[PDB]
Write a protein that binds this ligand. Structure first.
Ligand SMILES: CCNc1cc2oc3c/c(=[NH+]\CC)c(C)cc-3c(-c3ccccc3C(=O)OCC)c2cc1C
Ligand SMILES: CCNc1cc2oc3c/c(=[NH+]\CC)c(C)cc-3c(-c3ccccc3C(=O)OCC)c2cc1C
Lengths: 184, 184
């Protein structure tokens, strides 16, 4: 009756005031004290590896409930999953604007990845089969992830401000990143 | 001497808070009164247009200065241009953050936008020949510009954090931008 208020506080804080959020305001929302948070989340990073897993879970649980488990085409499957990502993102700006710092902050662990890699078996093998091998290496994977998110968030941004073309931005955005990240 | 101060301040604030940045914080950081800022620039939107041009001219001066005539190959010529642009962004990180948020802000006038296209007449032609027809159009230009800027921004951010591999991020990002925006 408070943990998801200490994550319903962080999301709304990381969002507005960047990875350096003021734990003071944080308390004023979940209604707790400093050590309280630290009795759920040991350190500030654990908070950032857990809040990321929290916000990731939701994003995936969202992306799975729209998976038409029947279609074959790797690109078509990637196209349908891109729709979900944009949807969740438009539905949950603050959430998305918080998962944004997290995936590009480095305060993340390598097990946090396998949590965010396995947590959706379908996209993981799909990427292995579609993404340039260079964006699958240890050295340039984060870069590849960075480009994908920057393209998704740009697509989110335009969709939200011009709702009548939204569909066209989604399709245009998807095709752009597909050429950028997959095999020719 | 105050106008330049206002510009320099507006750059630093927009980089941090986008176009929502306060006109009071801007004046204050430039060591002038908020009333004064508004005698130089009657609206916030007028400030937004001038700083855009200020920044664009600065960015294009760098590109022109570093352009090699000897370059006869089209793809190679846009690579060299890309390096300069990234470099300009590595050198001037707030200038680029401000430039990107201004560029995508829907408050730019038609003349600003026209006068911008026409600072690098030759690169401007270059873009018309290379770039996907759809990203040059009336409806979707602004999206293209956004996609482009997202890619160079992510390139720039990875190169600055992990400079050991700066050259590779820059090359990888160029190739990603090329497949995303240019025609076959
Ligand atoms: C919070 C959301 N976080 C992420 C969401 C992502 O969604 C992705 C969707 C994709 N299509 C569906 C729209 C493709 C092709 C790659 C994606 C990547 C991705 C990009 C570059 C390299 C690897 C991956 C990647 O996921 O590697 C898995 C083996 C990705 C990465 C992150 C961090
Ligand atoms: C502050 C910087 N402002 C801009 C700088 C830009 O630099 C660009 C460099 C390029 N090559 C070198 C790396 C290419 C190919 C396109 C570029 C575009 C561009 C991208 C998409 C659609 C049109 C254009 C464009 O410039 O259209 C002109 C008609 C571009 C756009 C803006 C706003």
């Amino acid at each position: 009756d408070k943990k998801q208020a200490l994550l319903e506080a962080a999301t709304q804080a990381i969002a507005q005031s960047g990875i350096a959020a003021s734990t003071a305001v944080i308390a004023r929302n979940a209604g707790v004290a400093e050590g309280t948070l630290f009795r759920y989340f040991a350190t500030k990073d654990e908070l950032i590896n857990t809040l990321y897993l929290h916000l990731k879970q939701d994003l995936c649980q969202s992306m799975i409930m729209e998976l038409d488990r029947s279609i074959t085409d790797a690109k078509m499957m990637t196209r349908f999953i891109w729709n979900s990502y944009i949807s969740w993102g438009l539905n949950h700006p603050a959430r998305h604007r918080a998962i944004r710092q997290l995936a590009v902050s480095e305060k993340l662990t390598k097990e946090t990845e396998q949590r965010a890699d396995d947590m959706f078996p379908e996209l993981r093998d799909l990427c292995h089969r579609s993404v340039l091998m260079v964006f699958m290496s240890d050295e340039y994977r984060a870069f590849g992830d960075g480009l994908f998110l920057a393209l998704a968030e740009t697509t989110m941004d335009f969709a939200a401000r011009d709702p009548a073309r939204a569909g066209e931005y989604i399709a245009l955005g998807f095709e752009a990143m597909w050429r950028a990240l997959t095999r020719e």
